[PDB]
Design an enzyme around this catalytic site. Structure first.
Site, short mmCIF file in Angstrom:
data_model
loop_
_atom_site.label_atom_id
_atom_site.label_comp_id
_atom_site.label_asym_id
_atom_site.label_seq_id
_atom_site.Cartn_x
_atom_site.Cartn_y
_atom_site.Cartn_z
N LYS A 1 0.70 -38.02 19.30
CA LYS A 1 0.89 -36.73 20.02
C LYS A 1 1.39 -35.74 18.97
O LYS A 1 1.84 -36.16 17.92
CB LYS A 1 1.90 -36.85 21.18
N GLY A 2 1.31 -34.45 19.25
CA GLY A 2 1.92 -33.44 18.40
C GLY A 2 1.75 -32.09 19.04
O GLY A 2 1.21 -31.98 20.13
N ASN A 57 -1.65 -43.19 6.25
CA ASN A 57 -2.95 -42.56 6.40
C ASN A 57 -4.11 -43.37 5.86
O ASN A 57 -5.23 -42.88 5.72
CB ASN A 57 -2.91 -41.14 5.85
CG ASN A 57 -2.08 -40.20 6.72
OD1 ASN A 57 -1.56 -40.61 7.74
ND2 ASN A 57 -1.99 -38.95 6.34
N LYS A 78 -0.82 -40.91 1.97
CA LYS A 78 0.30 -41.85 2.12
C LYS A 78 -0.14 -43.09 2.85
O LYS A 78 -1.24 -43.19 3.36
CB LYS A 78 1.44 -41.18 2.87
CG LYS A 78 1.14 -40.93 4.34
CD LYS A 78 2.34 -40.32 5.03
CE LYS A 78 1.92 -39.17 5.90
NZ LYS A 78 2.67 -37.97 5.48
N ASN A 128 -10.77 -24.68 -0.52
CA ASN A 128 -11.00 -24.12 0.79
C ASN A 128 -9.78 -24.20 1.68
O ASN A 128 -9.77 -23.58 2.73
CB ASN A 128 -12.21 -24.80 1.45
CG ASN A 128 -13.54 -24.34 0.86
OD1 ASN A 128 -14.38 -25.14 0.44
ND2 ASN A 128 -13.74 -23.04 0.83
N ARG A 170 7.38 -18.49 4.40
CA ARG A 170 8.28 -19.47 4.99
C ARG A 170 8.00 -20.86 4.34
O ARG A 170 6.84 -21.29 4.13
CB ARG A 170 8.09 -19.47 6.50
CG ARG A 170 9.23 -20.08 7.30
CD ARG A 170 9.23 -19.60 8.75
NE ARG A 170 8.45 -20.47 9.64
CZ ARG A 170 8.05 -20.15 10.88
NH1 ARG A 170 8.31 -18.97 11.41
NH2 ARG A 170 7.37 -21.03 11.60
N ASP A 175 -2.12 -35.29 2.23
CA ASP A 175 -1.28 -36.22 2.96
C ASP A 175 -1.62 -37.62 2.62
O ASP A 175 -1.55 -38.48 3.46
CB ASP A 175 -1.50 -36.00 4.47
CG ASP A 175 -1.01 -34.67 4.92
OD1 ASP A 175 0.13 -34.36 4.55
OD2 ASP A 175 -1.73 -33.95 5.63
N1 LIG Z 1 -12.86 -36.00 7.24
C1 LIG Z 1 -11.92 -36.45 6.42
N2 LIG Z 1 -11.58 -37.74 6.46
C2 LIG Z 1 -10.58 -38.21 5.58
C3 LIG Z 1 -9.95 -37.35 4.68
C4 LIG Z 1 -10.31 -36.03 4.71
C5 LIG Z 1 -11.29 -35.55 5.56
C6 LIG Z 1 -11.60 -34.24 5.49
N3 LIG Z 1 -12.83 -33.76 5.52
C7 LIG Z 1 -12.77 -32.43 5.42
C8 LIG Z 1 -13.72 -31.49 5.37
C9 LIG Z 1 -13.38 -30.14 5.28
C10 LIG Z 1 -12.01 -29.81 5.23
C11 LIG Z 1 -11.56 -28.50 5.12
C12 LIG Z 1 -10.34 -28.27 4.47
C13 LIG Z 1 -9.86 -26.98 4.32
C14 LIG Z 1 -10.59 -25.89 4.80
C15 LIG Z 1 -11.80 -26.12 5.44
C16 LIG Z 1 -12.30 -27.42 5.61
N4 LIG Z 1 -11.11 -30.80 5.30
C17 LIG Z 1 -11.49 -32.08 5.36
N5 LIG Z 1 -10.75 -33.19 5.37
C18 LIG Z 1 -9.40 -33.12 5.44
C19 LIG Z 1 -8.76 -33.75 6.49
C20 LIG Z 1 -7.40 -33.67 6.69
C21 LIG Z 1 -6.60 -32.93 5.86
C22 LIG Z 1 -5.18 -32.92 6.11
N6 LIG Z 1 -4.63 -34.27 6.04
C23 LIG Z 1 -4.76 -32.14 7.35
C24 LIG Z 1 -4.22 -31.02 6.45
C25 LIG Z 1 -4.31 -31.97 5.33
C26 LIG Z 1 -7.24 -32.27 4.82
C27 LIG Z 1 -8.62 -32.34 4.62
#
Ligand SMILES: Nc1ncccc1-c1nc2ccc(-c3ccccc3)nc2n1-c1ccc(C2(N)CCC2)cc1
Length: 353
Positions: free
Chosen positions: A106-107, A210, A207, A40, A10, A205
């Site tokens: 919210k979401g 953020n 932008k 990951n 999808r 994301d």
């Molecule tokens: N904590 C942080 N603050 C600032 C930006 C990014 C992060 C951040 N830290 C991480 C640590 C691990 C992981 C992780 C990703 C995939 C699978 C398993 C773990 N992700 C982390 N991110 C992180 C946070 C938000 C996103 C999204 N905007 C939400 C889907 C996109 C992606 C990655």
């Protein structure tokens, strides 16, 4: 490779398209438009499968909590024994410690609340998801102070910068100077560099919404995900994507800092999506040639050709002319001198809330 073959997927954004998937022993599960380092984001680790028959029989859903954010991909096969093949193949503190002050977002999966911790007076953001972790040693990502659970909610307490949203500071000033953008751009690149290589994770994301500023005017990248003008072409047409999406994002964000306006605009989303895929950019005459070069390379439509898009990833941005004489270890240790300091005395100055 544990299993492979066509699935229907999808369209995460603008519906169903067949795509050739590859499950693997590392966890990864990825889909290419034809029979074809690891991230990951695409892994199946600690995900949760859900057979279903809406809105098409033989559908199934992979739901994953990645860090503090819930991720959903939905698929559909032709027969239930087929769906079943894939399926099998694929498989202290408490709420009393805080004051709840303002609804930041919210979401569908939960809420984010501005929160003061009673025992210190310090302000955090609390993500509460309707129904282990080592932090990133990097200062401009959002740190997780407390993670706990109630009987029907998952709770994550994380930094919340009190220096204002970069989207507001820009709305005010209209445009940023090429060297202020350089300051923001370098911190972002350091942060995304850390994520890409130290965590094998893409942020996806990047932008303006953020990005916030701390007390000192340094950058903070948000983690408040609950649920177009910034979508990479690659993401529109719904390919495999990777670390280069964040560089597309970095270009859009930098383009808008330095030109005070978006690189592609239009009221109609479908003509916006057309523009993202088809229009080259008309850059302003009012703009330095090293800047132009950075943006042009960051905004290449083919991820493989894009700046930052090679094996070297972020090293290719860090050594662009535009970033000449930035000491990157300096950046990581917050040794750059912020151009803008926001109106704020302490970590707790509610002036920007
Ligand atoms: N904590 C942080 N603050 C600032 C930006 C990014 C992060 C951040 N830290 C991480 C640590 C691990 C992981 C992780 C990703 C995939 C699978 C398993 C773990 N992700 C982390 N991110 C992180 C946070 C938000 C996103 C999204 N905007 C939400 C889907 C996109 C992606 C990655």
């Amino acid at each position: 490779i544990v299993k492979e073959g066509w699935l229907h997927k999808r369209g995460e954004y603008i519906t169903w398209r067949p795509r050739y998937f590859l499950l693997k022993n590392d966890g990864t599960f990825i889909g290419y438009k034809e029979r074809p380092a690891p991230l990951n984001n695409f892994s199946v680790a600690q995900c949760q499968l859900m057979k279903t028959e809406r809105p098409r029989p033989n559908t199934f859903i992979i739901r994953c909590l990645q860090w503090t954010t819930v991720i959903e991909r939905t698929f559909h096969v032709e027969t239930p024994e087929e769906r079943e093949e894939w399926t099998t193949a694929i498989q202290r503190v408490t709420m009393n410690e805080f004051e709840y002050l303002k609804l930041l977002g919210k979401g569908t999966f939960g809420k984010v609340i501005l929160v003061k911790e009673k025992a210190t007076g310090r302000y955090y953001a609390m993500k509460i998801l309707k129904k282990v972790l080592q932090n990133s040693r990097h200062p401009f990502l959002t740190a997780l102070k407390y993670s706990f659970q109630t009987h029907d909610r998952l709770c994550f307490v994380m930094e919340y910068a009190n220096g204002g949203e970069l989207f507001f500071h820009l709305s005010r000033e209209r445009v940023f100077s090429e060297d202020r953008a350089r300051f923001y751009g370098a911190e972002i690149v350091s942060a995304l560099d850390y994520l890409h290589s130290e965590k094998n994770v893409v942020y996806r994301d990047l932008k303006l919404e953020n990005l916030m500023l701390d007390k000192d005017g340094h950058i903070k990248i948000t983690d408040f995900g609950l649920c177009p003008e910034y979508l990479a072409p690659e993401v529109l047409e719904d390919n495999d994507y990777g670390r280069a999406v964040d560089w597309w994002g970095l270009g859009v964000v930098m383009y808008e800092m330095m030109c005070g306006r978006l690189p592609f605009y239009n009221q109609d989303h479908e003509k916006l999506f057309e523009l993202i895929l088809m229009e080259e950019i008309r850059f302003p005459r009012t703009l330095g040639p090293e800047a132009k070069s950075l943006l042009s390379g960051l905004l290449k439509k083919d991820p493989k050709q894009r700046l930052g898009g090679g094996s070297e990833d972020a090293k290719e941005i860090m050594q662009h002319r535009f970033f000449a004489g930035i000491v990157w270890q300096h950046v990581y240790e917050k040794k750059l001198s912020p151009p803008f300091k926001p109106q704020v005395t302490s970590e707790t100055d509610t002036r920007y809330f």
